Enzyme design. Structure first.
Site, PDB file in Angstrom:
ATOM      1  CD  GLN B 162      14.587   8.877 -29.256  1.00  0.00           C
ATOM      2  OE1 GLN B 162      13.965   9.730 -29.883  1.00  0.00           O
ATOM      3  NE2 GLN B 162      14.175   7.619 -29.159  1.00  0.00           N
ATOM      4  CB  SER B 371      11.814   6.575 -31.700  1.00  0.00           C
ATOM      5  OG  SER B 371      10.599   7.082 -31.181  1.00  0.00           O
ATOM      6  NE  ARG B 372      13.095   1.141 -26.314  1.00  0.00           N
ATOM      7  CZ  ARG B 372      13.699   0.104 -26.877  1.00  0.00           C
ATOM      8  NH1 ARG B 372      14.168   0.163 -28.113  1.00  0.00           N
ATOM      9  NH2 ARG B 372      13.845  -1.017 -26.177  1.00  0.00           N
ATOM     10  CB  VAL B 373       9.942   9.613 -27.907  1.00  0.00           C
ATOM     11  CG1 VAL B 373      10.893   9.721 -26.725  1.00  0.00           C
ATOM     12  CG2 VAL B 373      10.713   9.652 -29.212  1.00  0.00           C
TER      13      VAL B 373
END
Ligand SMILES: Nc1ncnc2c1ncn2[C@@H]1O[C@H](COP(=O)(O)OP(=O)(O)O)[C@@H](O)[C@H]1O
Ligand SMILES: [Mg+2]
Lengths: 57, 506, 89, 473, 51, 85
Positions: B162, B371-373
């Site tokens: 990331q 975030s994307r996680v």
């Protein structure tokens, strides 16, 4: 050996019914705790007594 | 000594061979210089973004190829070069040494050794400008990156691959969190499993040489210099050095990534890189696009940060985790450069100045740091405990704002408000204190599960230390089980619940 | 060419009588032959701690003490304090 | 050498375009002298336009300049006279002494744009200079070769603090000093020069302690930009010639950075809209690279940034603590109490105040002093509100010890003997630590509070105590 | 001791640099022009012939 | 900013006291004379010393206008003296 001692000490601390109003046994408790902390610090930070001349010389 | 003599003889033999081979294959006459950009005649068939040798000794590279004149940006001080100087071209695209020898070494943008520790041993040379991997070579971010911050950086993780942004004002902790992550990576790169080692690489672009010297001193104080590359361009050198240093750091990062290894790159304060590109473009005859910024700033951020990716098993399963840093003015995340970099990254970490001045050293705002996680690319123990805690904390902040708006069933009477305030006070950390993932689940679990209702905000700081000491002294069983398993199961959840409501009374 | 021999003799004559061989100094007046191994021998010594850390002083610290063979006096003192603490329970 | 000469082609306000011949073009950052009826004017090159023409920036007004005027090339950067002959003399950006004291009889002229040292030569060792005043050398000890600074107002004694600092460095370290006048108001500059003369530290007929380089900002922006450069050159020459830990005095970083930004704007550069300054990266970085620690000496720049009404606009003055290694704030509150050193001990922090940097005992003493002062103010709130009675005996001990420390911070200045007539003293760093720790444990509690006032060193503390017990008591 | 030896190597390197520049200045004075001019003229002739 | 940097102190004026009624809208908090004390007639210099603290205290405690009735006697006296001045 330390695990069982810690177990019994903490169980005694949390099971105090007629063992309250203390002034020095808790002091010995912190003494033992910081002694164990120093033990752990010494084991994790054990510098090399002999000189590592195999790779340092 | 003996080595300088033979090195000099061999290199001057190669120099005579080069001078006697194919003349020089192209030259040029300097037409103009200034601010690290140089016009030059000749170079009729010069390659694009090609390194060029100047008679004085300064390096160069070709951003612009006009009919007749060639736009060369000067790699170093422009004082040495004058009018009419012969400009030999190196015959190859701009490259930078890449390999395992750069570990423990500090180099400039061009890759030359600047720490003075000796020559750089590189397996090969990679172009500073490399196309980012495609969709199929890229892989979903699933491997966690242990930030070691004991804060929102854990509940909402980073993960391997990331480009998690670090926004905020100056002196808010962006470099601080970057260095804490680098230090925490030592626990995993000090072993033998290369699939978990994170060979860090720092990008100290636009950083004063005293600051980067202190940074490398702190790194080797904690034995972190063995795995960290400090390829950077300080404020002393010219703007093109600043522009290219992050790209060559990206080249090193892909070399680590393309070899199956995992590397963490922190683009520290890309703002000076953007303004260095501004300085190039102003006198390279490229009109600015928007807000005095040339339009290609977004494109350059795109190519530089999209190179950071997690490779698939076919490509070697390598990771190139990126930690971009931007210095915003007055917390203005709506400015141009913010807008582009927040749209270029996979989530951000906000570090407002007010939180730093309040007392929270991490100074991270939970509300905007996304975030994307989310509950992904984590250890698993933290992802189950706080897979959606960020939304709860944001709602806590909104209700607390709502609570102060009017006197109603709110304030301490709100369990959500109490839990949110206790968790926000929980999420704190001191610098140079990397905390492992095992000593982070119990605190967040106590916060999320409503076990901190009767612990008080002021006493949460002492509660953290007491609870951690409790685990590390007389409850190491479940802690080590979580550490080795990398996940909390039903047995581990039950043991953690036992520990937390046994220690809630203290 | 001319440089191919000139610079090699330059870097093989002056460095020869500059260090390594450790004799005389032709190119410049200040000699480093007695400077780096003799005057700079105490260089790091001045930079570091001298006679304490460089020599690693064998500081034989006093051994850990104890209750100094305290008799039953401390035992009944402990009895008394425990009794007066437990009397108000 | 060939007689390099040029012809003036354009005068862009301060910018002057000069046409040279083939191979006669000087590099950039190269002085170009032009003979003018009002003295001597030189121009440094910053841009090469082409066709044997170089764009230059004047160090002074371009009044009366004519196309075709002969321009003489010095050969390198703007050489300025260097040496002990420059001490106590007003020398401008070009190098001509503007103190009306005659020409400078310097045997050397080091160029201002000297090659900065390499990264491998950047010594990361952190050791603390002894200043001569206990409060500065203990609470916020000054980093050697770092970037320390002064943040004070008007009327608090910033200038006299500069005088004491330079005098103490001249007497304790044995090293001279330099003060720069970038972006100076000529009124305050004349006042500072008058105070410098009247303090008797620059003996015009004798020894001078500060090489007061001075450049008026009524001059074009290039002069403001390069007056810091020539002050840096003087400091570097002193460091590389004499084994002295000389200290450098920048009167304002903000003025230098604004001058650099307008220099860039004239040259053809532009900042970003709505107000933001990133252009300074090259010049600010080069200036920092000119202030490091070398093997033989060192230069410790002082960033005497005046407070801009509690609002730092430009990025460089904004959050100076990033560039600061030892903050020395001169607040009016401490001077209101009568303590002559206006250094606020609580707000004067140093990045080098660490156990492994200044020393174990130094760090312990400094931390204990800071904690005692914090408790002192915290309990002073309740002393003022609820009275002295609402206070415990341990709080009483802490309050009295911290009050004794605070009154001990007032020490004489060797430059104030004419300003207020005090026997100025030069304390020792070891003596400072010993006295402060002796006050810390409380072994000097019986000493009267007035004895701690207006003294330097514990020996002077007991001397004043016995004098008070012998004359008044 | 290892960093002291590294500093020793650095100072030896810079002393070698001073010796090199001093010898360069010495070569700037002695008559060392015609022979090297002939030498690298022959070198450039051979370079042209080799292609 | 250039003008305040070159000038040795400034005297700020605002139209807001100009509209409320204080037409000579000179505010001490932002106004400053770096050499004014050295170049002031001695009588005003010695008497104006007490003015500065009084009006500064009045302006800092001026946030709670309709609150000094029961806030503090010292605050009420400061407000009275400040508006009188
Ligand atoms: N516990 C802490 N966590 C983070 N920063 C701290 C802490 N304690 C002190 N600091 C200070 O915060 C500063 C962080 O600044 P930094 O983020 O590096 O600036 P920038 O954002 O411009 O890179 C450091 O200089 C350090 O002195
Ligand atoms: Mg930083």
């Amino acid at each position: 050996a330390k695990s069982a001692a810690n177990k019994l000490d903490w169980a005694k601390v949390i099971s105090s019914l007629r063992i309250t109003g203390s002034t020095a046994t808790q002091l010995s408790s912190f003494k033992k705790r910081n002694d164990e902390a120093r033990r752990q610090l010494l084991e994790l930070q054990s510098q090399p007594t002999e000189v590592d001349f195999s790779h340092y010389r | 000594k003996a080595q300088p003599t033979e090195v000099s003889s061999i290199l001057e033999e190669r120099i005579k061979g080069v001078s006697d081979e194919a003349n020089l294959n192209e030259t040029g006459r300097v037409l103009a210089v200034g601010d690290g950009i140089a016009r030059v005649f000749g170079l009729n068939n010069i390659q694009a973004e090609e390194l060029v040798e100047f008679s004085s000794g300064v390096k160069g590279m070709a951003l612009n190829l006009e009919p007749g004149q060639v736009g060369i940006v000067l790699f170093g001080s422009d004082r040495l070069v004058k009018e009419g100087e012969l400009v030999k071209r190196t015959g190859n695209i701009v490259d930078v040494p890449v390999g395992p020898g750069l570990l423990g070494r500090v180099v400039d943008a061009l890759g030359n050794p600047i720490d003075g520790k000796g020559p750089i041993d590189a397996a090969g040379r990679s172009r500073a400008q490399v196309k980012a991997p495609g969709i199929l070579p890229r892989r979903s971010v699933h491997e966690p990156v242990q930030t070691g911050l004991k804060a929102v950086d854990a509940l909402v993780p980073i993960g391997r691959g990331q480009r998690e942004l670090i926004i905020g004002d100056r002196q808010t902790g962006k470099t601080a969190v970057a260095l804490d992550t680098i230090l925490n990576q030592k626990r995993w790169n000090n072993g033998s499993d290369e699939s978990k080692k994170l060979y860090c690489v720092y990008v100290a672009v636009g950083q004063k040489r005293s600051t980067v010297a202190q940074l490398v001193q702190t790194l080797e104080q904690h034995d972190a210099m063995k795995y960290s590359i400090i390829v950077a361009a300080t404020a002393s050198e010219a703007a093109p050095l600043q522009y290219l240093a992050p790209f060559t750091a990206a080249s090193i990062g892909e070399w680590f990534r393309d070899n199956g290894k995992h590397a963490l790159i922190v683009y520290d304060d890309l703002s000076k890189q953007a303004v260095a590109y501004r300085q190039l473009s102003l006198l390279l005859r490229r009109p600015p696009g928007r807000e005095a910024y040339p339009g290609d700033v977004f494109y350059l951020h795109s190519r530089l940060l999209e190179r950071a990716a997690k490779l698939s098993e076919k490509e070697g399963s390598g990771s190139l985790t990126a930690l971009p840093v931007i210095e915003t003015q007055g917390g203005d995340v709506s400015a141009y450069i913010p807008t582009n970099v927040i749209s270029i990254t996979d989530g951000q970490i906000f570090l407002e100045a007010e939180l730093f001045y309040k007392g929270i050293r991490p100074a991270i705002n939970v509300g905007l740091s996304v975030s994307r996680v989310g509950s992904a690319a984590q250890v698993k123990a933290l992802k189950q405990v706080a897979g959606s805690l960020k939304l709860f904390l944001a709602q806590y902040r909104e209700v607390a704002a709502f609570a102060q708006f009017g006197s109603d069933l709110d304030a301490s009477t709100k369990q959500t408000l109490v839990r949110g305030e206790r968790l926000t006070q929980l999420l704190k950390q001191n610098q140079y204190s990397p905390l492992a993932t095992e000593e982070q689940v119990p605190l967040i679990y106590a916060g999320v599960n409503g076990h901190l209702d009767g612990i008080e905000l002021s006493r949460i700081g002492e509660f953290e230390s007491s609870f951690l000491s409790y685990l590390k002294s007389n409850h190491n069983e479940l802690l080590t089980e979580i550490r080795e398993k990398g996940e909390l199961s039903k047995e581990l959840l039950a043991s953690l619940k036992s520990a937390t409501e046994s220690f809630v009374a203290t | 060419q001319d440089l191919y021999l000139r610079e090699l003799k330059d870097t093989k004559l002056a460095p020869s009588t500059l260090q390594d061989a450790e004799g005389n100094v032709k190119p410049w007046n200040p000699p480093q032959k007695p400077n780096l191994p003799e005057l700079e021998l105490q260089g790091p010594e001045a930079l570091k701690a001298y006679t304490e850390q460089n020599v690693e002083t064998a500081h034989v610290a006093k051994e850990s003490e104890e209750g100094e063979s305290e008799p039953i006096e401390e035992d009944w003192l402990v009895l008394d304090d425990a009794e007066e603490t437990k009397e108000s329970h | 050498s060939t007689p390099i000469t040029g012809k003036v082609t354009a005068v862009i306000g301060a910018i002057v375009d000069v046409h040279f011949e083939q191979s006669e073009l000087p590099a950039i950052l190269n002085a170009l002298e032009i003979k003018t009826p009002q003295g001597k004017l030189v121009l440094e090159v910053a841009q090469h336009l082409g066709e044997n023409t170089v764009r230059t920036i004047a160090m002074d007004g371009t009044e009366g300049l004519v196309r075709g005027e002969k321009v003489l090339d010095t050969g390198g950067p703007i050489s300025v006279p260097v040496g002990r002959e420059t001490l106590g003399r007003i020398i401008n950006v070009i190098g001509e002494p503007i103190d009306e004291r005659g020409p400078i009889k310097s045997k050397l002229r080091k160029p201002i744009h000297a090659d900065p040292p390499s990264f491998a030569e950047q010594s990361t060792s952190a050791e603390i200079l002894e200043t001569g005043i206990k409060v500065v050398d203990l609470l916020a000890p000054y980093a050697r070769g770092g970037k320390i600074g002064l943040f004070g107002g008007a009327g608090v004694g910033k200038t006299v603090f500069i005088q004491e600092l330079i005098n103490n460095i001249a007497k304790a370290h044995g090293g001279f000093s330099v003060f720069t006048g970038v972006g100076e108001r000529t009124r305050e500059g004349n006042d500072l020069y008058r105070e410098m003369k009247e303090t008797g530290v620059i003996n015009l007929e004798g020894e001078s302690k500060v090489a007061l380089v001075f450049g008026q900002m009524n001059e074009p922006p290039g002069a403001r930009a390069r007056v810091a450069l020539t002050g840096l050159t003087i400091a570097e020459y002193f460091r590389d010639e004499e084994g002295q830990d000389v200290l450098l005095f920048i009167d304002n970083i903000f003025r230098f950075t604004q001058a650099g930004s307008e220099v860039s704007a004239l040259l053809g550069r532009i900042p970003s809209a709505v107000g933001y300054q990133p252009t300074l990266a090259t010049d600010m970085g080069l200036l920092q690279e000119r202030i490091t620690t070398t093997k033989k000496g060192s230069v410790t720049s002082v960033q005497a940034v005046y407070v801009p009404a509690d609002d730092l606009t430009d990025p460089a003055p904004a959050t100076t603590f990033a560039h600061l290694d030892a903050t020395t704030v001169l607040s009016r509150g401490i001077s209101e109490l009568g303590i002559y050193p206006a250094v606020d001990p609580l707000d004067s922090k140093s990045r080098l105040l660490d156990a492994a940097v200044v020393g174990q005992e130094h760090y312990d003493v400094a931390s204990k002093v800071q904690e005692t002062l914090q408790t002192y103010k915290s309990l002073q709130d309740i002393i003022a509100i609820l009275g002295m009675d609402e206070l415990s005996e341990q709080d009483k001990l802490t309050v009295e010890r911290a009050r004794k420390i605070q009154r001990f911070l007032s020490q004489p200045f060797a430059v104030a003997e004419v300003f207020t007539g005090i026997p100025g003293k030069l304390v020792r760093l070891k003596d400072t630590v010993a006295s402060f720790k002796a006050v810390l444990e409380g072994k000097y509690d019986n000493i009267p509070e007035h004895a701690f006032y207006m003294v330097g060193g514990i020996e002077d503390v007991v001397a004043k105590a016995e004098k008070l017990a012998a004359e008044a008591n | 001791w290892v960093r002291y030896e590294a500093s020793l190597r650095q100072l030896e390197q810079r002393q070698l640099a001073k010796s090199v520049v001093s010898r360069v200045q010495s070569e700037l004075g002695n008559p060392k022009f015609q022979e090297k001019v002939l030498q690298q003229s022959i070198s450039e002739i051979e370079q042209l012939l080799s292609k």
